[PDB]
Every structure is written in C-alpha cells, then in structure tokens.
C-alpha cells in the first residue's frame, strides 16, 4: 500500500449494524434481510427480521 500519497480511497467506520452480528453484507451497507449468525456458545440470534 506504500507509495500512494493521496490516491487512496475513502474510509468507512463500522456502523451499529456492522459491529453487531449482521451475518452478511449487501454491498456498501449491511443487509436487512438475512438473520445474523447464531451465537456458537449460546443459542441466541441478536439480528432478526420482523415476521
């Protein structure tokens, strides 16, 4: 990556959804349809979708 002074691309911060158990991306933004991955330890799923 060295050598490029300012030709680099912008940066983005992990939003509320990215930092959570999103379980997939729909491009530049988290997907709002696929439920998050089940916690391996517990049986929890914190990212759901309204039925």
């Amino acid at each position: 990556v060295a050598g490029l002074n300012d030709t680099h691309a912008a940066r983005k911060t992990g939003a509320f959804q990215f930092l959570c158990a999103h379980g997939g991306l729909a491009g530049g933004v988290v997907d709002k349809t696929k439920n998050g991955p089940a916690d391996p330890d517990t049986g929890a799923v914190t990212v759901k979708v309204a039925q």
Binding site: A2, G3, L4, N5
Partner: protein
C-alpha cells in the same frame, strides 16, 4: 530509519515549486527466539551403584 542518501545535485531555482511527496516505509527488523533442550534419562538402578 536511517537518513537518506546524500543528494549532491540539490540545486533548485529561486522561483520553483516543491516536487512530489517523499513517502517512505517504516521498515522494521525482527527476530524469533529458539528453544534449546537437553534431556537426560538415567535408570534408578544405575543411581544406586557406587
């Protein structure tokens, strides 16, 4: 991060603009440890003799 090579031709004009950037890396020197082992197994019988 030692200095750069001397520029014997560091001659410029009086009304010139600066040149491109000088992006240099952050080269690091590293090493790893080494495990030295010395095993010795002697029967208990041999430990009782004189």
């Amino acid at each position: 991060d030692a200095l750069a090579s001397v520029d014997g031709n560091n001659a410029h004009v009086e009304g010139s603009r600066a040149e491109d950037g000088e992006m240099k890396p952050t080269v690091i020197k590293s090493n790893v440890t080494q495990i030295l082992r010395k095993v010795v197994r002697v029967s208990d019988t041999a430990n009782t003799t004189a």
